[PDB]
Amino acid sequence: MAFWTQLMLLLWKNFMYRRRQPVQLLVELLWPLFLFFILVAVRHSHPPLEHHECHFPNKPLPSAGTVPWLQGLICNVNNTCFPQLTPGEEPGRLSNFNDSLVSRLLADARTVLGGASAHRTLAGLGKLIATLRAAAQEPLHSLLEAAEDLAQELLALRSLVELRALLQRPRGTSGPLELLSEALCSVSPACSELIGALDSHPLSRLLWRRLKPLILGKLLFAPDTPFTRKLMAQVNRTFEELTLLRDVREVWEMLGPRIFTFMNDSSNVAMLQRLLQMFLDPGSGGYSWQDAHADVGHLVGTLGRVTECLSLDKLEAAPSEAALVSRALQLLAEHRFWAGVVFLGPPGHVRIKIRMDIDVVTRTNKIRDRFWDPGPAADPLTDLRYVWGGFVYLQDLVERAAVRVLSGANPRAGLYLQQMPYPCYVDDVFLRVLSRSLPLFLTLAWIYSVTLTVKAVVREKETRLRDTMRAMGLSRAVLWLGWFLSCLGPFLLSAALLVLVLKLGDILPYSHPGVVFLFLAAFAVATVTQSFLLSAFFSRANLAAACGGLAYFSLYLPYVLCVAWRDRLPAGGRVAASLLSPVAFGFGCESLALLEEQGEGAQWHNVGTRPTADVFSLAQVSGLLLLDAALYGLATWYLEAVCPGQYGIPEPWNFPFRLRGLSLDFYQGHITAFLGHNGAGKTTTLSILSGLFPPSGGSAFILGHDVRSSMAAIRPHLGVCPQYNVLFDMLTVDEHVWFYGRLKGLSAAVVGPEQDRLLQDVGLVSKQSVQTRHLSGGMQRKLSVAIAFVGGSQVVILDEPTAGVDPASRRGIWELLLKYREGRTLILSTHHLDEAELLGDRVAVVAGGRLCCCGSPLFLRRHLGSGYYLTLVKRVGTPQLLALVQHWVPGARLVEELPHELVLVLPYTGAHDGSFATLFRELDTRLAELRLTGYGISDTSLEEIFLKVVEECAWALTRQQLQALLLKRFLLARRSRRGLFAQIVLPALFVGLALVFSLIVPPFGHYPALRLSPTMYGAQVSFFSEDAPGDPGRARLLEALLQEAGLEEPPVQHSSHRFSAPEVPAEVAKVLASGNWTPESPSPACQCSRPGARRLLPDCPAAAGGPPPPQAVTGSGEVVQNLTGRNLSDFLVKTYPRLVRQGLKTKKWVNEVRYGGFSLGGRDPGLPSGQELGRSVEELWALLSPLPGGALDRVLKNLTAWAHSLDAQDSLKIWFNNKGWHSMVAFVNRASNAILRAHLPPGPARHAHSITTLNHPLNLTKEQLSEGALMASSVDVLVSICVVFAMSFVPASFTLVLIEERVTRAKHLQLMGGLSPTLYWLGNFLWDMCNYLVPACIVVLIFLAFQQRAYVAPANLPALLLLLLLYGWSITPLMYPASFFFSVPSTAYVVLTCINLFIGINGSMATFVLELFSDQKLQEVSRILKQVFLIFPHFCLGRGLIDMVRNQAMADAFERLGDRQFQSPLRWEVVGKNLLAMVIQGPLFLLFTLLLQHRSQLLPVLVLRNLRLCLGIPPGECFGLLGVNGAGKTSTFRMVTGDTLASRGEAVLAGHSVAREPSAAHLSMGYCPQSDAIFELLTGREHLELLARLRGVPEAQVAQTAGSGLARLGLSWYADRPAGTYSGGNKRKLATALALVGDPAVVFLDEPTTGMDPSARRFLWNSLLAVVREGRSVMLTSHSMEECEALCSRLAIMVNGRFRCLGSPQHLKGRFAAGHTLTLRVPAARSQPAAAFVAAEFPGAELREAHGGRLRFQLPPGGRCALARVFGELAVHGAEHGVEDFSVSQTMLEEVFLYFSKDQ
Ligand SMILES: CCCCCCCC/C=C\CCCCCCCC(=O)OC[C@H](COP(=O)(O)OC[C@H](N)C(=O)O)OC(=O)CCCCCCC/C=C\CCCCCCCC
Ligand SMILES: CCCCCCCC/C=C\CCCCCCCC(=O)OC[C@H](COP(=O)(O)OC[C@H](N)C(=O)O)OC(=O)CCCCCCC/C=C\CCCCCCCC
């Protein structure tokens, strides 16, 4: 098994990283349970409320009468909404009050006092024409008969008992308004008395509270012409007839004493002998006197003082409308205003306009509501404002008067309003918005797992360790499938444990959790392969965490701005904005929440069917999410093939079409080195041999071991060791050998002893359970070279296997390699030549892309070496030494004449003659008198051969230095067109977007708009239903109503044909005509909300309400349905939820289709005889007419009028729909206009004249403008927050330049080597304001670019310009110290943006101290007075309130000057501008704090004495340093040199103390760090020149010294900006050498020693001696061997702070050494007898190396084991013992240094 064990290993790895971090795993599983245990608690504190079916009673308008109007004003003040239909919704019946006391009184009075007994009463009274008396047996007889017959008829015994009972009561707590409210309807000195009386009952004051404007307030009418007075006399005729209740008290008081004075004299004389002569009724006549006049006077004593509280006058003229507004606002604060009629226009058209208050008329900027509420919108206070405010009670007083004036012919048709019935429903505000708050709460709940998958995928690539698996045989199918199946772990487990929360905490009940899980487990396979695609762009694992969450939440906001404008969203633009995955979950979630409002959720059998018409099902959403996963991790398997990163080869425009060599021969037993050049030759050959790309780039084409193109054969034979430590962090040491063992062939049982063998051979068997985070940095590299040898490899390619390693571990690595070579082949390729000399074999070098030479280093020394050299160890005279050297062989030379030593150049042919022992036996006899203590031998070093064979194939002088900083910062600005100008464009873009976003919201206070009342809703349905057609008059009004609706006049063709039913469906017919119904019968029922099946509106079958009624269509688009003789409160209930169904998709601006309609019909069917009472009063008008109209006969006129005008009244119910806000008055207006064009004589279609009304509320006041304005003044707060955020943004781009430039070169070379901090640390500020000034102005002009804030004038922006100029002068010092305190590289950018956002949100909540409430003791004023002073220490926030208050003052002055008189502008005044200038004009103090950080240098010659280090280092002499570091060695030199602090003891810093003498401490010490001291982005020598010319130049030494640095550095021939590997530390050290032209001081420096090729290091280690040769100090740090051999002296090594050694390297090689090295080449069939010969001549001479004929021998000094004999006998006796060619040297002191490595 190959794939299915690579997958098990690659999936066990991800499980082991996911197990060792159990706060990653626990937090990412309890975080989506702190987001969905908030929704469970917001659900259980807003439960659904379910309401029954409301049927409402009717509200008659004053056209109906004055007793029905007052009954429907006082009684049904509440809109009770009965569940059974009221008696005023059924056809014919009109008034639902025929059991109250008033209506029974009028009924009995009309049926008795107009009855048939009054007929014979008037017949008896007609006999009195005789001359008897002017006020006889037979007229007395007839009158007695008739009156006695009528006596029992007035014993009506059913209402008058109740009236006498109600009037004669004790007082009680019955208020003077609650007294009438038992009689009307059953289930100002005179006003102020009852006003005090009414307070005892809250219902009484709640009825008076809005009855008060109608009976106190006044009414005003504007243009005051003859026409207007002629009209408003008719409106005053309504309040005139209410003062006929009062003059009957006048008639009663002039009649009452006349009756009462007929007592005790007339009762005996004047009536007793006239009445009592003749049973029951003569006994009733005398039993009547006591309670007759007293009770009717007690009745009229109350009735008549109600007229005394009504004003006599309510009308009052005006000159014009502009005086009406002023007089109105005068009267309104007097508490006496009803309304103001304003007539209008310049013929017959009338243009009435009612201007009311604004707490009293409904507001007029909308015709509907934004968010559909499923109520009936019938609440008596908050949305019937036309009814209790009194708009519609005044409308059809005025309309009826205009109808009566424009036409003549007093119409009579009373109007009754009637709201429509409404079905059973539920109100559930949580689930109406769940399509908007479920996507948000799961985009945030899975944003922590998306950042963990992007972090893991990118760190498997940043650490160069996806490369070391794909170069180990692994696929790219496997690597990506192991990330898919393992990042779908927690995603698919936290989407199976929040389905329980949804179904079980009732967020989505009635659903079935299978269908919800399988829709949340296709969103989770489309967000895994999105966090892969987001990680195909990045290469850093810490930027990726902070951009994965941001680009996962930035893909959701296209759903937020797509649910808002959902109405105008075409369905193609919704199946193509579902190609972002957090949006296709939006449109599936809005369709899973439309199936909850229909009772049954997402079950298995509706998961293919769309709920409403233009929505998705759930199967189309899951299909879109899988398509949207497929083509979305299909980009990754393309995008990483054409942009792999920056290590790796691209492969553009894919289709799926699909040891040896020419040059070398590596052998089967050697340890071949490969040291050529890090150029075009070396890294390509190991790449081709390691097979990562096919070969075409020059070098060679012979396939190496088996076959280059059959790589899977030799992939289990060779192992590579890369540069990087191939090592997983959180896997322990044993599991690495296990993992790379099982991945590379070997079965699961043969891998067993392999762990034992490796962990024994590397030296790690104790710590075989430590994670490899917890390993020292040279123990990892010695493990990571041991897992190249696993599985028995043979052709092991190593690749620099010692870089950056502590030298003890570097010898451990060499021991490991030297034992692992006997049966293998090693091709290690290093730079440092000590390895290739020491552990070398046949050494091959390449140069220029081709092979240069190869062979053993002895062979290369034979045919390329110069020859032997002799050095002398100890001015006597040079030519005597020349003669002594040229005594034997005259071809020699003495190359360097030094006073300390000499070095010769001898020919190696000179020793080939056997002339060695002659030389040194004479020198053994001559060194006694040459004044020299000894000699030593040397060969040509291997680096000489290497370089030589490479040669074949290859007061004003301080202010001109601002410019030195300025051009480096200027070129930083100029060259960074790829990572910058996000510091300029971003704030202008954000301030433009913020000002554009301040356009959607209209301002407040602009209620009063003209609003033509007629029907304005557009296309609509509106019915009608004629009740009784018997009379010709109301057959005209019907036609006029239709011609109002838009119906044409009926032509002579199809004359009885305008209406026609649609097609009834047949199933409807066979379900209707089988339950035996007629249009007055109930229809089939509809199903309400069962216990456990709640739903908004009921589920109605198709035959609910009946067949469709005979409709017709107009031309304006108004369906008009004939609905005559059907049950009209059964049709309107059962067809409501199917008219409004397209508005149940979005629930915003819902066009309900049917808004109202009419219902005609004559008077109430019931009690007859409207003309009998008039006949009775007309007959009883005889004999009683004293005053013809003198306040007595007017009673008789109005009583005859009240009788005669009773039977001929029409009706109109007006059904309205209150969710349209203006339907009440639209249809009252159409009714009045249609009554007008019916009494026109020529034809009802009269096109001359027409009533219109408007609705224009009255001018607002100061607390009415300002309160609504400050409530609306919140989008400008968002504008201000965006302004302060975007303008605080770009200094966080400024400080990035200082983040990686803290201390690294400028602070510790440019400011310390010559001590100039004074310019630099304020010149950063100067350059920041210099390059802030233009991104200030370029943000200033975005105000002007969009006409949304700027508005050109001196009053706005004379100082906001200066405000936006001083922001960056202020903000610059207070946010530098993220750089030079708590150094973090490019990671606290999130922190800096967050803290500026925290400043902005403190400024945001600063001014919002008030929302609705306030307290008593000036606490808000004290809090805003404290925030006035709170701007003192916070320069980022004080402005953030001044911009707010300045915008408010701007708009305040604009309003108060464009509405009222002229006030002073305050553009510069103290409360906004001068105090802010005084606050902000001190950032130099913060600049001094920032520079005082540098004056403390931080956030707030060598004598060592037991710090047993007995070290004396004198200045002026070079000193060496080797050994180990990191144990307290470099730190010890740091606390010597001042980087670190020591706690106890004493410290010497050049004889100067720190806290005692600051001047001597600053001036006398300069110490370069070891932290790769460079600013990486430069352009080369010219930075170095200009930092040199920061000191002492008359603008002319720049050229001289730049020419010197160009001439003396030959490494400047390359590009004007070099690459970075070519430049760097070598030019930096040459720059320091150039900087010491003015430095005669100690230059003890860390010398970082960047590991470059030795070609430039020849010039470096020559010129560092050649420049500093004056006798001053030279300091360098050695870590490899050749730089120790280049320039060293007496060297110090710390061994736990103890010295066990001391000496210069000549002293070290004299005392501590081990003699000489014999290098020898013999054939292997002769080598061990040659070793026997060596042991014969040298019994006991030590041998170190013996392999392949390569023999090395260690020769101790003393006797024959020393020099002077050995090469002589090897020339004599060793010549015939198989030796062909060999050389000797003194011991190269790596192995002498092995004792120094064994010291520790
Ligand atoms: C950086 C950009 C960020 C992008 C984010 C913006 C997009 C989405 C953000 C938030 C989601 C919601 C968006 C903000 C509000 C959404 C709309 C809103 O809620 O307005 C006020 C609502 C009134 O609306 P309705 O629900 O009555 O709607 C009428 C009708 N059904 C319809 O379909 O329209 O009254 C109420 O809130 C009910 C109060 C009493 C019961 C409350 C109970 C229910 C209320 C809330 C439920 C939990 C939501 C909590 C939200 C807090 C986080 C903001
Ligand atoms: C109002 C509600 C706001 C909700 C915001 C949710 C954010 C996280 C919520 C709670 C965190 C819980 C508190 C933190 C827990 C403390 C522990 C902690 O710091 O974790 C850091 C983790 C560590 O994982 P690693 O990356 O090191 O490796 C994990 C790897 N995959 C593996 O398992 O092998 O990496 C990270 O996540 C670093 C990023 C930090 C996470 C935030 C990353 C978010 C970054 C940017 C997006 C923020 C919000 C989006 C911007 C506007 C939204 C308003």
Question: 1289 and 1421 in one domain?
Answer: yes
Of ligand 1's listed atoms, the one at least distance from the Cα of 433 is: 26
Rg for the chain, CA atoms, rounded: 55
Identify the residue whose C-alpha is closest to ligand 2 atom 12: 27
* Amino acid (one-letter) located at 1420: E
Ligand 2 in reach of 454 Cβ (< 6 A): no
Instruction: Please tell me if the CB atom of residue 46 comes closer than 6 angstroms to any atom of ligand 1.
Output: yes
Give the whole-angstrom CA distance, residue 1451 versus residue 1459.
12
- Into how many domains does the chain fold? 6
Task: Tell me which H or E stretch contains 867.
Answer: none
Distance CA 481, CA 1498 (A): 51
SS3 1485: helix
Closest CA to 1689 of 1531, 1513, 1536, 1559: 1513
C-alpha 1717/C-alpha 585 separation (Å) is 79
Has 623 been labeled as part of a binding site? no
- Residue 553 Cβ inside 6 Å of ligand 2? The answer reads yes
Cβ proximity of 218 and 381 under 8 Å? no
Residue ending a domain, choose from 1668, 1702, 1736:
1702
Short-list 1013, 1589, 979, 1264, CA closest to 329: 1264
The reply to whether 1684 and 1732 lie within a common domain is no
Question: Please, what is the Cα angle at 1187 between 1184 and 1193, to 5 degrees?
Answer: 65
Expressed in angstroms and rounded, the spacing between residue 453 Cα and the centre of ligand 2 is: 11
Ligand closest to 597 (CA) is: 1
Considering the domain boundaries, does residue 497 fall inside one? yes
Q: Which residues sit directly before a break in the chain (C to N > 2.5 Å)?
A: 135, 187, 278, 346, 658, 874, 954, 1500, 1507
Angle at which helices 391-407 and 226-240 pack, to 10 degrees? 120
What is the DSSP secondary structure assignment for residue 1700, as one 8-state letter? S
Neighbours of 165 (CB within 10 A): 9
DSSP string, 1631-1653: HHHHHTTS--S------------
Whether residues 1637 and 1726 share a domain: the answer is no
Dist. CA 1651–CA 1630, nearest whole Å: 16
Protein residue closest via CA to atom 37 of ligand 1:
429
Give the ligand with the smallest distance to the CA of 15: 2
Ligand 1 center–CA 573 separation, angstroms: 25
Nearest ligand, measured from the Cα of 1278: 1
Does 677 belong to an annotated binding site?
yes
Do residue 1521 and residue 1658 come from a single domain?
yes
1538 is in an annotated binding site: no
Distance CA 481, CA 486 (A): 8
Residues 372 and 331: beta-carbon distance below 8 Å: no
Cα 997 to Cα 937: distance, rounded to the nearest angstrom: 87
Provide the CB-side half-sphere exposure for 1536 (13 A, CA).
20
Task: Scan for tokens 């710090």, then name that residue.
Answer: 1507
Residues 761 and 874 in one domain: no
Do 1420 and 1298 share a domain, yes or no? Answer: yes
Is residue 909 located within the same domain as residue 931?
Answer: yes
Distance 1274 CA to ligand 1 centre (A): 18
Half-sphere exposure for 1726 (CA within 13 Å, toward CB): 11
Round to whole Å and give the CA distance between 502 and 1499: 53
Let me know whether 879 and 764 are in one domain: no
Claim to verify: residue 473 and residue 619 sit in the same structural domain: yes
Phi and psi at 419, nearest 5°, equal -80, 155
Query: What's the CA-to-centroid distance between 433 and ligand 1, angstroms?
Result: 6
Give the residue among 422, 420, 415 at the shortest CA–CA distance from 94. 415
Classify residue 226 by burial, with Cβ atoms within 10 Å: 0-12, 13-18, 19+.
Answer: exposed
Cβ partners under 8 Å of residue 979, min gap 6: none
Identify the helix (H) or strand (E) that includes residue 1562: helix 1558-1563
Distances (CA, A) of 474 to 4, 723, 743, 1464, 1483: 12, 20, 9, 81, 61
1527 assigned to a ligand binding site: yes
Establish whether 1529 is an annotated binding residue: yes
Q: Whose CA is nearest to atom 19 of ligand 1?
A: 433
Q: Which of helix, strand or coil describes residue 1241? A: coil
Q: Which atom of ligand 1 is nearest to 39's Cα?
A: 48
The atom of ligand 2 lying closest to the CA of 448 is 8
Q: Which of the 8 DSSP states describes residue 1471?
A: I
Buried b (16+ CB within 10 A) or exposed e, 383-394: bbbbbbbbbbbb
Distance CA 787, CA 726 (A): 9
User: Containing domain of residue 1337, as a range?
Assistant: 1273-1443
1523 marked among binding-site residues: yes
Give the tokens for residue 1266: 């300002």
* Upper half-sphere CA count for residue 182 (Cβ side, 13 Å): 10
Interval between CA 451 and ligand 2 midpoint (Å):
7
1438 vs 1417: CA distance, rounded Å? 26
Q: Which two tokens stand for residue 1455?
A: 């309003």
Using the Cα atoms of residue 1436, residue 1437, residue 1438 and residue 1439 in order, give the sign of their dihedral. positive
Report if residue 566 sits inside a domain: yes
| Type and span of the H or E element at 1746 | strand 1742-1747
Same domain flag for 1412 and 1432: yes
Compute the distance from residue 450 Cα to the ligand 2 centre, in Å: 9
Burial of residue 973 (CB within 10 Å: 0-12, 13-18, 19+) is middle
- Beta-ladder partners of 1717: 1754, 1785
Domain C-terminal end among 843, 859, 880: 843
What DSSP state is assigned to residue 998? T
Q: What is the DSSP letter of 1154?
A: B
Q: Is 348 annotated as a binding residue?
A: no
Q: How many CB atoms lie within 10 A of CB 1707?
A: 13
Technique of determination: cryo-EM
Number of H helices, E strands in the chain: 75, 30
1425 by Cβ neighbours in 10 Å (0-12 / 13-18 / 19+) ranks as exposed
Among protein residues, the one with the nearest Cα to ligand 2's atom 50 is 550
Whether 418 and 1214 have beta carbons less than 8 Å apart is answered as yes
Q: Is 964 annotated as a binding residue?
A: no
1657 C-beta closer than 6 A to ligand 1: no
Cβ 237 vs Cβ 243: under 8 Å: no
Ligand 1 nearest atom to the CA of residue 430, by list position: 44
Q: Is the CB of 1281 under 6 A from ligand 1?
A: no
Residue 1450 to residue 1356: CA distance in whole angstroms: 7
Token reading at 330: 């005068």
**Helix 117-125 crosses helix 137-153 at what angle (to 10 degrees)?**
160
- By DSSP bridging, strand 1213-1216 and strand 1156-1159 are antiparallel
Contact 1193, 1185 (CB under 8 A): yes
Cβ–Cβ < 8 Å for 1120, 1024: yes
Residue type, 1054: H
Which ligand 1 atom is at minimum distance from the Cα of 432? 31
In a domain, 524, yes or no: yes
Question: Which spans in 1576-1688 are helix H?
Answer: 1581-1588, 1597-1608, 1625-1635, 1654-1667, 1682-1686
CATH number of the domain that residue 818 is part of: 3.40.50.300
What is the DSSP code (8-state) at residue 1465?
Answer: -
Closest listed residue to residue 888, CA positions, set 928, 908, 929, 916: 916
Ligand 2 centre distance from Cα of residue 448 (Å) = 5
Q: Is residue 1685 part of a domain?
A: yes
Query: For 1505, which DSSP code?
Result: -
1213-1216 vs 416-419, strand pairing mode: parallel
Residue 1645 within any structural domain of the chain:
yes
**Is the minimum distance from the CB of 430 to ligand 1 under 6 angstroms?**
yes
Answer yes or no: is the C-beta of 433 below 6 A from any ligand 1 atom.
yes
Please name the residue whose Cα sits nearest to atom 53 of ligand 2: 553
In sign, the C-alpha dihedral spanning 1753, 1757, 1761, 1763 is: positive
Long-range CB contacts for residues 631-638, cutoff 8 Å, separation at least 24: 632/526, 632/529, 632/530, 632/533, 632/581, 633/529, 633/530, 633/532, 633/533, 635/533, 635/536, 636/480, 636/529, 636/532, 636/533, 636/536, 637/476, 637/480
Domain boundary among the residues 827, 843, 859 is at 843
Cite the DSSP H helix spans in 114-246: 117-125, 137-153, 160-167, 180-183, 191-197, 202-216, 226-240
679 has binding-site annotation: yes
Residues 714 and 835 in one domain: yes
| Segment (H or E) for 835 | helix 833-838
Residue 406 lies in a domain: no
Torsion over CA: 1121, 1123, 1124, 1128 (sign)? negative
719-747 burial, b for 16+ CB within 10 Å, e for fewer?
A: bbbbeebbbbeebbbbbbbbbbbbbbbbe
Does ligand 2 come within 6 angstroms of the Cβ of 447? yes
Determine if ligand 2 sits within 6 Å of the CB of residue 451.
Answer: yes
- Whether residues 1682 and 1729 share a domain: the answer is no
How far is Cα of residue 79 from the mean position of the Cα atoms in its chain?
Answer: 46
Separation of alpha carbons 222 and 352, rounded Å: 10
Q: 676 among the known binding-site residues?
A: yes
At 844 the three-state DSSP class reads strand
Q: Which of 15, 455, 557, 730 to mutate to test the pocket of ligand 2 (most atoms within 8 A of CB)?
A: 455
- In a 3-state reduction of DSSP, which class is residue 847? strand
1764: domain CATH number is: 3.30.70
680 labelled ligand-binding: yes
Residue nearest to atom 31 of ligand 2 (CA): 452
CA distance 1038 to 1036: 5
For residue 1014, is it within any domain? no
Half-sphere exposure of 1522 (CA within 13 A, CB side): 27
Question: Would residue 152 count as lying in a domain?
Answer: no
Other C-beta atoms closer than 10 Å to the C-beta of 1278 total 13
